[PDB]
Each structure stands twice: as C-alpha cells, then as structure tokens.
Amino acid sequence: MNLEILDLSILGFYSLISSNSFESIAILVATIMPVITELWYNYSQLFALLYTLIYVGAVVILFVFILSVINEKEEYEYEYSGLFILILVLLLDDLDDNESNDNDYNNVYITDYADWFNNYNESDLSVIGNLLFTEYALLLLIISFILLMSIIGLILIVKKD
Amino acid sequence: VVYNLLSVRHNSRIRIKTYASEVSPVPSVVPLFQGANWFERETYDLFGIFFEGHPDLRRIMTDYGFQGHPLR
Amino acid sequence: MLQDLFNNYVILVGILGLIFLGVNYFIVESPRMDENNGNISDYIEKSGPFECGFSSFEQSHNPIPIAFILVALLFLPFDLEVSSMLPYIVSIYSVGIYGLIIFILFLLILIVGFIYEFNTKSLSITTILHKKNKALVKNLY
Amino acid sequence: VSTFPLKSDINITKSGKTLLSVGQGGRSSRTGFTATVFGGTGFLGRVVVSKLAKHGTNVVVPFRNDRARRQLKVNGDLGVVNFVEFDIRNLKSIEDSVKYSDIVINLIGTEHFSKNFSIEDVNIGAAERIAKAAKEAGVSRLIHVSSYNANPSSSSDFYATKGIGEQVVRDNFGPDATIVRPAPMYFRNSPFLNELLQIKALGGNVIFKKEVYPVHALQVGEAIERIAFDDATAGQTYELFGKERYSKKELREMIKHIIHIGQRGYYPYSAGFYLPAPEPFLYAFALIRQYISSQPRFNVDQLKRSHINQEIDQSAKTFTDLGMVPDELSEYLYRYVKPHISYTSQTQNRTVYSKEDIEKLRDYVNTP
Amino acid sequence: TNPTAFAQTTRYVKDSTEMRTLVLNLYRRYLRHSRGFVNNYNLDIPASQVRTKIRQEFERQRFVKDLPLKNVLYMKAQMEFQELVNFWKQQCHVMQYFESIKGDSFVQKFLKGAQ
Amino acid sequence: FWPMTFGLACCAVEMMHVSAPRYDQDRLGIIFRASPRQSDIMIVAGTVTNKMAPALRQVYDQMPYPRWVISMGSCANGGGYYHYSYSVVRGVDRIVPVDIYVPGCPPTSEALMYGVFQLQKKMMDGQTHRMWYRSY
Amino acid sequence: QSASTLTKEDVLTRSVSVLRGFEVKTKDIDLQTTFVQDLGMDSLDLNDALVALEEEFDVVFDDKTANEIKTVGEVVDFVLANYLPTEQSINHTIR
Amino acid sequence: AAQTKDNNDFYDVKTKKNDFFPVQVDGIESSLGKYEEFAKDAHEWESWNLQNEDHPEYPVKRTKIRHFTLNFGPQHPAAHGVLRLILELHGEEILRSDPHVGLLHRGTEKLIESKTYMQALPYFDRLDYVSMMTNEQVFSLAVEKLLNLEVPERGQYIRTLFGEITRVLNHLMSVLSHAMDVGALTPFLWGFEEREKLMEFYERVSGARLHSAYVRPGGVSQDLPAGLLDDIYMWATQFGDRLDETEELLTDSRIWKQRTIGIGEVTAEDALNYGLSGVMLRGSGVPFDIRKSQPYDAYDKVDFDIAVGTKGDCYDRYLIRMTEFRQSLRIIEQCCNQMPPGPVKVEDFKVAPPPRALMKEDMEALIHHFLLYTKGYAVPAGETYTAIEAPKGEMAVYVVSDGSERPYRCKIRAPGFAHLGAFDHIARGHFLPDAVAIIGTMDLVFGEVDR
C-alpha cells in the first residue's frame, strides 16, 4: 500500500474546505512534507534536504506576515460547500492519476548496469559544485546579481525612509 | 483641600489650604503640577471633590462602580 | 549504505510521540473522580484565555504590527546566499583556484548588499514614536 | 433565593422542637434548622446545599468523594456546612448524618449500575435504609427525590426502581414523607443538556426521539427549599415539570444553530454530529461498554427509556401548589449553551438569542 | 502624559441650556455603544434591553432642578461611560447590574419579624 | 509541588524567603509557576480586596485539576487587621475552597513550610483510584 | 466599491419603516414630517430614533446636527450626503 | 471631544492636505460620446472612475480599531504584587500606559481614625512591608512632634541604626528583584540570605521577622538585647564582600547596561514637577535628601554621602542604590560605635509604659499602665506634615489631631504612589521589556501605593 496516496487525498480534501489564511500556510507545509519524503525515498536525498533547509525558512517568514495582516474577515464568515459535493469531486479526481499516456513507459520496468570505471567516487553535490563553479560560473554570478537586486528591492519597497 | 509644596532651591516647605463642599468646583493644579494628577483623583475618589479642569478624573482606589466616598 | 535501521527509528519516534498523549489520557482520573465539575467543554471559566485575572478585548484576529518586518524579508536573500555555498563546500579541492576565485566573486557581489544595508540602516527597529527635544524660546518685545 | 426563606422567625417542627431564626437572611444569619442532604456532591445537591447554606441552615453533607465536597464549604458561613464520610453499605455513618438534622433530603439515585452497586441497591436499598435511619433519629421532615416517570410496574429498570423507592420511603418513614418527581433538569453542566451538547452522539436517531417536559434546576432546588420549610407539604407528591413539551431531536437541532455548527454545510456531517446506527448495534455497544468501559456510558436501560416519553401524573401536585411559576426553557436555553458557542468572543457581534428568538428558531427547526 | 481613551476634561457648566445639550449627547453615546456592551461583557440580553436600561437611569434624573447637582451627576455619568467602554469593569459587575429586580402587607411582615 | 505566584501583600515576602537559600523550597520539588495552567497549588499570600476577588476567582478557575488552595496569613484567613474595612474580603474562603489555613501575621517561612507539609501529608492519603474500585 | 449606492427614495423608505416600529402618533411619514409635532417624540424618544436610524444606515450623526434636527427630510438629506461604505480588507477588493 | 461628521467613536473619515494643484477637469468624453451619456453604465467600468485613491482627499471610512491592549495584570511576576497595568502596544512599543491600582487598597486611612495612636501604629508596618521600621518612624515622628516630646539620646540612635538596617533590607528587595526581573536570577538568591541575617536582628529586638511594632511614639518598645551589637558588627564585617560580588554580575556587564542605559530617562524639571523624590529625583542630577534637608533622630550625628546621577535613567539609579548600600553600612558601623547609654523611651508614663517591676509595686505606675492601655494618650489639637527619607523616597504623613486619643485624619504620602503616577510619562516610546525595567527601578510596593 502506497501511503503517499492517502496523504495527498487528505491534503486535497483540506485544500477544498480551507477558509482562513492560516489554513493556507498549512497547506503549503502539508505539501512540502510529502515532496521531501518522496524525494528522500525515491529519487534524490540531496534535494530532499535542500528543500527542508530553504523552504522552512521561507515558511516561517510567510507565517510571520500572516500575523501582521490577519484582518478578522474569514473567522465569522460562512461557507456552504456540501460534504457530498466535496467527496464526489475528490472521487472523480482520484480516477485519473496517469500524467503520461505512454503505457509501455509506465508499465515496463528497466534496469541499469553498473561499471567500475568511476574509481574517483564522490557525492552528487561535489559534481554539481564542480560544474556550477567552473563551467556554469556565469549562471552562479548572475544568481548572485539577482540576490543583490532583491536586497535593494526589498529596502526600496518596505522602508518608509 | 490641602497642598504641600516643596522647594528644592531654598530647602523650604509650604502648605496651601483651601475649602470646598460636596458640589462646589475646585480648580485643578494639574496644569501647574503634573504630579497632582493622581492625588486629585484619590481626593475625589475618597471624598467626592469636584476638580474642574482635571484631564482625567475617575476612581483610583475603590472598586469599579463603587458607590460612596469612603473617607467622608 | 543502508538506512533500514534509520527507518525503524523514525517509525519509533512517530509512535513515541503519540504515547505521551495517550498515556496522559489513560492515566488522569475521570472528572467524576475529581471535584466533578463536568466535562472540560462546559467549564468555560477554565478554558478561557489567561489575562492575569482580568478579562480584556478579544483581539485574536486583529493585525499585529511587526517592527522587524524588513529584517525578516532580508533574511530570505541571505539565506539563499548561505545555501548557495553548499556546492563549494564539498568541491573545494576539485574546482581549485578557479572555483575559489569564483567563490570570492559570489561573495563580493553579495557584500555590496551588506554595505547597502549598513549605510541605509535598514536593519533597525521601526518605531512609531520619536522623542525630540523642543527648545523653549521667548519672543520678547 | 429571596432574602429570607421563611414566613416567620419561629418554626415548631413536627418532632416537637421549636427553632428560632436570627438575622435578616445573609450569610451571617441562621434559620435554626439542621438539614442533611444525601447526594449533596451531585448535580442537584450543589444547587440544594447552596440554597440552604446561604440563609444559615446548617447542612450535613455525607460524602464518598473527598475532592467533590470541597466546593460546598464556600456556600455557608463558619460551622454551617458539615461533612460526614459515609457509605450506603455502612449503617453507623448513615445514622451519624441524620443524628441532629430536622430535615433529611435524599438525592441519592443512579440510572446505571456498576461492579459494586446495582440499580436496586441505590434507588431502593439506599432510600429504604436512609428513610428508616431518619425515623429512628426523630427527623421531622423527609424529602425523597424520585424521577418523573416513577412506576412500580415499568419496563425500565430505572423507572421501576424509582417507583418502588417511592413506596418503600413511605412504608418506612411513614405517610408524612414527601416525594418529588423532577422532570429532566437543565442548568450549567446539566446531565440532560450535556448529552444534547455532545458532538459525537452515537445512535441519536433512536436516543434523541424521547419527548420530555424539561424544568429549570434552580426552580427544582428552589421548590425543595419551599417544601422543607413548609410543613403543609408533608406527605405530598410533587411533579416538577416545565409547561412546554420538547423532544430531544428538537433541542438537538435547536442547539446546533446556537453553536453555529451549521455555518459550514459540510462540517457537522464530517465531525460526527449525526451518527445513525441500528438499534441492535446500539444494544450491543451499550452492553459491551457495561463490562469494558470504567466510566458510566450510555447503558442498556437508557436505550429502552429512549422510547418511553414523560407521562405527567395528574393526581400529583405541581409548581402552582407551591405558589411558583415554572421557568421557560426558551428564556434560559441560550445562557446555558452559551459556553459551548464556538467563536463568540466578541469577534464581530454576538448573537444573543432572546426568549422570542428561541421560539422562532424552534419553528425553523421543525420546518422540513 | 496623555489621558486614557474616551476621557473628558472636567468642566463646571454654568448654563442650564448648555448642560442639557451635554446630557443629550452623552445619552446618545450610551445608546450607540449598547451593542458594544453586549459584546465585551457577554451579556445574556439583547442590546435592545440594554438601551431600555440606559433610558431608565436617565429618566430617574429627569427632573433634577439644581445646577450644581446636574454637574456632579453629569461628571459621574461620564466616568461610568469611560469605565464601560474601556472594559475596566469586570464582567461580574455588569452582569449584576442587570440582576437588579410586590411588597408584603403589615401582617406578612409582622409574622416574619418585619424590617 | 508547583504553587502559583500569587503574592498579594506582606505575606508574599515570607513566601519569597521560602525560595531563599536558607530554606530553599526547590530542594523539595517546589517550583513557582507564573501561569495557572502549570500550577496545582494556589497560595493566597495577602489581603484579598473586593476589587481583586473576581480576578482571584477567575485565576483559580483556570487551574486544571487536581488543584489545592493554601490560605496564608490573617488577611487571607479571615481579614485580619482589615477585617472591618469596606474594601476587604473577610476570608478568601468566601471565594474559593481552601484546603489548609496557615496562621500568622505574617506566618514565618517555617510556618508556611509546615502548612505545605500538612498538605503533602493529605495528598499522600488520597485514594482516588481505590475509590473507583471500592466506592463506585 | 468604495462609493455610495443610495437613492433618495430608498433612504426615505428605510427611514419610514424604522420610524414605524416606534410608538408614533401617525404612520403617515414623509419628508416634511416633523418629529416633535407629527410623530410626538420627547427628548429621549427622538434620540432613540436617531440612534435607530444610525444603525439602519451605518451612519453617525454629529452632535451639532443631531441636536438641531427637526424633520424626517433632514435625516434623509444627511444620510445621502454623509454615507460611505466601510473599508474592506486588503483581500476583499483585489482577488 | 464631541462627535463630528468626519470623526466619532466608531469611525473617522481622514483626509490629508492636498499638496498638488486643484486641477479642474470638465467635459469628460470618450470617442463614442460624452461622459453623461454613459455615466449610468460607468459604475461597472473601473477605467471610468473619476476619484483616484492616491488623492490626499479621497474619502475612506476606517473603523476605529482598538490598539493592542494588554493587561499586565496582578498575576504577573513583573508586577510587584497586585498591579493591573494596562498597556496599549504597537507591536511591543508602548503607546499609552494606564496603571490601575486599588487592588491592594484596604482603607488603612479610614481604619486608622477608629484606632488610638498606639493601636494605629501597626498599620504602618504594612504599608511598605519591606521597609517596615522606617514606616513606623514617620508616624512616630509626627505624633512626637504633635505631643511636643522628643526621644532620648539612645532611642534616637536605635531608630537610626535600624533605620539603615531597614534601608539595606529594602534595597536588597528592590535592587535584586529589579535585577531578577531583567533576568539576573542569581544575585536575588545571594542577597536574600543577607535579608535573613538582617531579619534575625529584627526578630531579636521585637519578636517578629517582618512586622515589628518596635518604633513607637516616644522611642522604642523594648531595649536592645544583650549581645545584639556584636552580631550586627560581625555581619557588617562581611557585607562589603556581598555587595562586591553582586556588582561583579551587574555593574560592568554589557547586557545589564544595555537594559538600563538610556531607559526611563527623567529630566530634572520633570522629576520635580511630577513629585519624584529619593533616587528618582537624585538620578536626574538634583542632590536632595531628606536626611540632610530636615534631619531627624541622630542622622545629624553620623556621616554619609549621597550619590547623584547625571543621565536620569535606570542605570544611574542602579548605581545610586548601590552607593546607598555602602553608605548605610557606613552609618551602621558608626551607630554601633556611638550607641550611648540611657533610656530608650521617653521618661513619661502618660505616653510610654512603665516597667513591669515598677508597675507591680508603685500605685501611680499601675494607674498609668491601666490608663495607657484602656484610653491611650491624648494628643493636643493641631496638624503636621512630617517627612522622612524612606528607602523608596519621600514618605510623609499628614496627621490631624482633634485633642482626643484618636487621630482625626491621617493621610499617608507614599513615594511609590507619585512614582507610578509618572509611569505613563516615562514609559512612552519604550518597548514592553523596558516597562519591566521601569517598574523595577521605581521600587514599587503596592501596599504603600494603595494603603
């Protein structure tokens, strides 16, 4: 039983019924956690950890803004929905989870063959840094330039002075 | 109504006595002495003396919505 | 590398957290064994917010001004800069002097942001009151 | 309540004592009476003990729970409230409670049974024992509180034992024993309203169809005060009920709107507000929890009583015989379900349901 | 220093016409804040009942003639208003304020010791 | 034994000296908590006035069970020096149940510790779970 | 959005209904209808009506105007000239 | 002030002044017609709005929202007892402070009129209940002044000796509790053991650790027990190290100075106008002390120095209160070395009780003992305003005598009452943690404030 399917089923239910802004900042965290875990267990543990290191800091800053802008509006308001229309919507959605229509690509299993030629064996992050700091160093230096612009941009927007 | 004043310059003390009734307004010295703000509030709270010109005159010692002026 | 032992530990941590809630739930005497003031739902005098004894305005959903919001926003650009050094940490030897110079250039462009924030005093606290000393002057005649 | 609960400052008990009263009726005053309230730590005892102790009547409160009795001492002045550790299986402790009292009030009664006490032990065995112990101690007035549908020949083990308990109280204490038959009582932390205010009420489609004539608990506590201090009420049976008849389905639905659980079209159905179940499942679950759960849950006999509606005994006396007007649940329903309203807390504007608004809501509930 | 919210400076009014206007303005403020009183103090009655209670207290002092008594009554009515709006009174005090309310015959009082 | 910080008047000075190094209540496991949620003992150390009584009752009601109340000093016991005052409650037991009464004006630190030891003795006699077995 | 949608006929119509729920001498209310003469309101009744007309239209009469108001038409004039919709949150408008 | 059209209790319509020209626009038209031809349907066309929200005079009805209002109520460690400090915050910045008191108002002044002068004395033990003996002294001085009596020489020195022991007892409570509220827990524990040693001297002379009705009109209730001065002198030999160790954790600490430097600044003008006295006045540059201005009870026969600040903030007053620690210890040593022999109470049995041995042999002693405890002593009609340098500041009593054995009126001037009345002026601008520092630097005991 792939229990990640159940997790996304609950998350989709709570995204349809979410009312206030605090629930939305919880839908975000309830989305990154399935992403981080599935990356950890299937494809990339490096990027599972990079997601946690960067998105959490963004989440708390996002949460602190909710405190300064919460404006009483959706606590006392009413929503109608209907339990039957919610579950029927989620049932129809769950029916079609085939993002791709290449049946052979989705059904036939493949393998790779290992070789011993790579005797200098290092992590993916060392190769990523090796290329990023040598061949795509321009991409890194532009990213540094964009980060500098954000620093100036945030000040010229928020600072009253 | 009794006002005890202190002069740190000359190291001297003086007293001012004035009179009042239950309905006769009394001038407030809060504009002159900002330290009289609470003392006038206490005097009103426990006696019921009408301090005209007090920026915020109200109960300071008795319970909220207390009927009566205890020191009479 | 095998992480099957790590998987069992994570499972135990998840179960262990629910044990504290459950054990406290099964151990506490039922309210009828206590003073018997009913279920906690009815006892609104207990479930109300703490305000040191005196009730006040219920301002839960009102907005709260935040004096350090600019510093909080600038945390994100600097957090990304710190996370950008991770590729260099584990590849310092391979990139050699070429990568080291590029690493310095990455940091030198971001140091202009540090100079900018210092000179603009953007990392201060945004007070709404200001204490200024007025001068007393006499328009004599 | 009032300021002085007596028509005079002198009262001669039917046992021969003459009791004078002192003071104007405050905490420092006395009425000269000593009363014993069995079951004073219960829901109704706290109402009764508070009304007796506030006017200076010495109250003996026999307790089995040491924590529950502590709040009773605050009701009276020094020396007014007295505690006796007791058990209905202990005879010396029962006599000690009534040894000095001129009035004995019996509020002991359960709708459940446990490993130690059956419904026959409490609703009959305790009531009979207390009535006899009261008589040997020379108590002038006995007041026994049965249920609203007391009947010695009832299909319900609670209604039957309550009905038999009425008989045994008169057969021991004599014809002068007074009997009270309260309807379901509503108040703060009321057992009647608590099951209606609970969210996850299983099998409400069966349980909540019973119709009743609910009565304010303060009036029932006030009526008992009238009965004890007026000897013309000896040997009488009182049916204390409200003027209006409600079915628990109506009140359950009326409460839902006051709690504003219906603000969402999905939330009540998702949260378990409606939990329909076949009656055999309700029987098995009630039967199973009777030997597994340690706390008194909805038992088998309460399932049977869900079908039996409240029948007012027409030969008994009412509030009007005591010179009192019954309160209306419409004028008190809001303030007693007010603690359970979800957001409230001066968010935008409270919806204070007046007496007129509650009756308007009742029609809307009954509209399909 | 600064005064608290809804604070008025104390002044001795010497004109009955000016006093009458000040009383009517304050009476309107009591009516407008009636819904606020129900919200803050969690009363079990509608705001319509609160406004009725306010009118009764103003009707009690309807026929006070002496000007010095008017100023003291007005000053005390302003203090109470500042107390209610700012939520300085505890909820128990406001609940008991609405708890306020046939006299017995001679014999009835005689039997119970009278007053 | 976690009392709630509720020092009202000169009776609070002696309660602060119980935490002082000479007596050091902390060695007995006694820690003062600011919030009523973390407290199970309420020590009323000082005069209870009419202006304070509703706040005192609200603070008491917010303590989760099991909760005990200690009344310390003549003010809290029966009013004391201010018994005939227009603005004093004549005993804290008119507002909250009291489990033990500590006498003195003020009670000494040892007098308060003795009162705590009496409460701990009564707490060790509790039979809540055997009450369920044998009385219910 | 942040502008009035009031007409003279609606404000008069809502004013009449709110004034009909009081104890007035006549139910025939128009613009020229005075409060003291036609409806018969003393000092306290008039201010009960003004606050009632305040709550209906979510407006607040100033002290100078309220003390000097005579006719029903004056109220309708005041509401039309001074009514503003209440500001909404930063999300109600742009979303 | 007054409900107006654009400003009332519930909302306001705020318009700024127009910086730009009042430009006139007439004849609005589109390419299909004039404005009036489509103005009926222009309500649905956002591009047809003639009112611009950036204009300074754009009408906006804004509800008046209560600012963040916090009850810094009685149940709070910062408040030294029962203080319902109501703060209107902007985040954590204080905008307005409303100290609500009377939670410890017990009607002491009302009750005193019902008591004789001897019976009313213990009431003073319970106003400033860490500086107990100083409170008794100001009442005793006022009654002695009205009685036209004076304490003998040894009695005056005893009141000076325990006047400075009491001052140390107060500053240990004040300085260390203020430090503990800032976050320095350890100095509180060290110095409270010094309080235990000092309260041992309190208990040996009177029999009560705290409420020692020992200073009475005419002298002291009982003489010093044998061996007391040696214990006091032995304590004094070590107390210098205790003060130094406390200063090791606070005085030069950068964290302590960041919490106190520039916090709660008070100008010398505002200190006088608001009636601040003692350390609050002296921290602002004013060198005024009541022990020097109006000397009393052998303070003229000892030597001490007054510390005066220059910046009038919390750090200046901390240094001043630490100097007074050492100046009191200087006085304590002198009193121990200069205590004279002789009677401790006035030699008058119409005011002071006779000895028990004389009471049970002399008829006139037994009459005076009988009359003192059943009627008190009459005080000539008059009034007085007597002030002392209490550890909190200037404490004074305004006593009115009607010629009887009971005081007609007794108004107690509490230094903390005046200090708390300036809190809103001082704490404005500062943040919520700074209110904790300002409260602790005033030395607020609310029994004194409320009484």
Ligand SMILES: CCCCCCCCCCCCCCCCCC(=O)OC[C@H](COP(=O)(O)OCCN)OC(=O)CCCCCCCCCCCCCCCCC
């Ligand atoms: C250690 C476990 C921590 C979580 C345990 C609690 C379980 C509750 C749900 C957790 C997340 C599941 C998906 C929910 C996404 C957010 C949607 C939401 O609004 O929260 C649901 C919660 C329930 O409120 P409810 O009364 O049912 O609905 C409103 C009725 N008007 O409404 C609330 O606002 C309460 C939310 C409390 C704060 C939760 C913060 C999010 C934490 C997520 C960590 C786990 C990541 C998600 C893993 C599950 C994915 C489905």
Ligand SMILES: NC(=O)C1=CN([C@@H]2O[C@H](COP(=O)(O)OP(=O)(O)OC[C@H]3O[C@@H](n4cnc5c(N)ncnc54)[C@H](OP(=O)(O)O)[C@@H]3O)[C@@H](O)[C@H]2O)C=CC1
């Ligand atoms: N809606 C209602 O509440 C109705 C009430 N009644 C009857 O009124 C009376 C008052 O009950 P109420 O206060 O409302 O709620 P409770 O269930 O709390 O009444 C039970 C009282 O009697 C005591 N009791 C039960 N069994 C025993 C036992 N073996 N030994 C000693 N004491 C026992 C209980 O003591 P303890 O508190 O220590 O557990 C409690 O005080 C009851 O007899 C009830 O049958 C009938 C119709 C309506």
Ligand code: SF4
């Ligand atoms: S009992 Fe005595 S020591 Fe305790 S608070 Fe009252 S006056 Fe102070």
